[PDB]
Amino acid sequence: CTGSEPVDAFQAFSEGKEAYVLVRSTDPKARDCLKGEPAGEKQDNTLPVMMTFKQGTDWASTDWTFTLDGAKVTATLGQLTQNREVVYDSQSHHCHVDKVEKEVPDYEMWMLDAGGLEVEVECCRQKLEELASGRNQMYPHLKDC
Ligand SMILES: CCCCCC[C@@H](O)C/C=C\CCCCCCCC(=O)O
User: Fold this and answer.
1) Residue 92 main-chain phi, psi, to 5 deg
2) Which atom of ligand 1 is nearest to the CA of 18?
3) Which of 55, 64, 66, 89 has the highest count of CB atoms within 10 angstroms of its CB?
4) How many domains is the chain partitioned into structurally?
């Protein structure tokens, strides 16, 4: 299950050309149907992204600025900041696993919303299990999305 190495966030995001959906999270507060979609070309070391999600039955969308530094991703919206590091990226950049850096860290698995490359998907799941062993996983994309 060796993936893409060394890990690079821009590469993990298919060079800002694709949308990714959150499929596994250890965070009980993870947004239902969370998806990230590029909203413009890379500008310097940043990438504009729209994050879409569903709250109850209502769809919502927020505008974030991603600052990339190797495998590190700093996402900002107004006074809000979320820090992550991409810790595993599949061979073809089809899925990846993040560590969400904060007091009690959380882990996430994101993937292209397209089908295929099941072996790479299984590898991401295995890697998430290793990084987050013993943590309960929730499934944000299995929320009638
Ligand atoms: C670029 C296309 C999307 C890629 C997604 C990358 C994935 O590694 C996650 C990286 C940053 C996630 C930022 C989450 C911001 C919270 C959004 C929901 C909200 O408004 O609370």
Assistant:
1) -100, 10
2) 2
3) 89
4) 1
SS3 call for 66? strand
Identify the domain containing residue 12 by its residue range.
Answer: 1-145
Q: Residue whose CA is closest, atom 4 of ligand 1?
A: 36
Q: 99 CB less than 6 Å from ligand 1?
A: no
CB count within 10 Å of CB 106 equals 18
CA of 130 to the centre of ligand 1 (A): 22
Q: How is residue 118 written in tokens? A: 């099941």
Question: What's the alpha-carbon Rg for the chain, to the nearest Å?
Answer: 14
Q: What is the largest CA-CA distance in the chain?
A: 40
List helix spans (H) across the chain.
Answer: 9-12, 118-131
The annotation places the binding site for leukotriene B4 at: 31, 64, 84, 96, 98
Extract the tokens encoding 34. 């969370």
CATH number of the domain bearing residue 38: 2.40.128.20
The tokens describing 13, both together, are: 């995001």
Q: Which residues are annotated as a binding site?
A: 31, 62, 64, 84, 96, 98
